[PDB]
From Swiss-Prot:
Species assigned in the record: Homo sapiens (Human)
Gene Ontology molecular function, alphabetical: cadherin binding; enzyme binding; ephrin receptor binding; insulin receptor binding; non-membrane spanning protein tyrosine phosphatase activity; protein kinase binding; protein phosphatase 2A binding; protein tyrosine phosphatase activity
Portion of the parent chain present: 3 to 281 of 435
Keywords: Acetylation, Endoplasmic reticulum, Hydrolase, Membrane, Oxidation, Phosphoprotein, Protein phosphatase, S-nitrosylation
Entry annotated with the keyword Chloroplast: no
Presence of keyword Endoplasmic reticulum: yes
Sequence positions bearing Cysteine sulfenic acid (-SOH): C213
Stretches assigned to the Tyrosine-protein phosphatase domain: 1-275
Residues annotated as binding substrate: D179, C213, S214, A215, G216, I217, G218, R219, Q260
The protein's name in its UniProt record: Tyrosine-protein phosphatase non-receptor type 1
Domain of life: Eukaryota
Quaternary state and interactors: Interacts with EPHA3 (phosphorylated); dephosphorylates EPHA3 and may regulate its trafficking and function. Interacts with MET. Interacts with NCK1.
């Protein structure tokens, strides 16, 4: 992978490789996402979940949420990629976390970036000021918060108000992805991924991890692509047979737009290369 990276870098063909992936990426219908009754549940008109892989809310009237299940068969890893919650979809977001039995939520953006709101403040900021989502009958409480230099980890408690059952959720918040471009080094991003792994949030004893940024495709795609490639390098008899382009195209069968720029594609290669040297 490193020799391939050096060749693409020296030939200046990141844009060409990226455009070939965009050209060959799967094109599946998103009929449910485009229904008029779901207009207020979507953040960007160009980012919708495919019907075949969308997560359904266990709701009789409207089961729609902009979220997709990415199921990586060989790696035995699943992820739910979703948009950053909207002011009216926070209850739906936490209903999905509850119903899917997720242990972790991975957030790759700040609430405000470039002076604009990228997602609703969907979790409580103080222990004593819990949030109640009346539409989905859930209460959410901040249990603890550990602020580090490149990321913050929070323990949240989700309570189903109907039964009074509770579930503990870990919120992994990468707070240092630059407003423009990608990080210069993948070191902090890889340390973040390893901290998510260590928590058990990506493990098969739990529901799939819920990952989002604003659209849930750019930085979200880089997170899952790096994690899956590293797992395959550890599992395979020939780790050099792991082709990041092929893994990305496989992921793109489940949600559109994963990796939004040639810069993110180059960053994903860099994170996999540096991650493999570490592992
Ligand atoms: Mg306090």
């Amino acid at each position: 992978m490193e020799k391939e990276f050096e060749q693409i870098d020296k030939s200046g063909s990141w844009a060409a490789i990226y455009q070939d992936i965009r050209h060959e990426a799967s094109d599946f219908p998103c009929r449910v996402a485009k229904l008029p009754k779901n207009k207020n549940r979507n953040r960007y008109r160009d980012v919708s979940p495919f019907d075949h892989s969308r997560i359904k809310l266990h709701q009789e009237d409207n089961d729609y949420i902009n979220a997709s299940l990415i199921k990586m068969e060989e790696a035995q890893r699943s992820y739910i990629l979703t948009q950053g919650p909207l002011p009216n979809t926070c209850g739906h977001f936490w209903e999905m976390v509850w119903e899917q039995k997720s242990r972790g939520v991975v957030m790759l953006n700040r609430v405000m970036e470039k002076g604009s709101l990228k997602c609703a403040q969907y979790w409580p900021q103080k222990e004593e000021k819990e949030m109640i989502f009346e539409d989905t009958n859930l209460k959410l409480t901040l249990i603890s918060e550990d602020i580090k230099s490149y990321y913050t980890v929070r323990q949240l408690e989700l309570e189903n108000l109907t039964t009074q059952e509770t579930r503990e959720i870990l919120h992994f918040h990468y707070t240092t992805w630059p407003d423009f471009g990608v990080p210069e080094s993948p070191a902090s991003f890889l340390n973040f991924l390893f901290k998510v792994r260590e928590s058990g949030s990506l493990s098969p004893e739990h529901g799939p991890v819920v990952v989002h940024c604003s659209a849930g495709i750019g930085r979200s795609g880089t997170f899952c692509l790096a994690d899956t490639c590293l797992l395959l390098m550890d599992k395979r008899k020939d780790p050099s047979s792991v082709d990041i382009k092929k893994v990305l195209l496989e992921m793109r069968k489940f949600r559109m737009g994963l990796i939004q720029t040639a810069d993110q594609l180059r960053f994903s290669y860099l994170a996999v290369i540096e991650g493999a040297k570490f592992i």
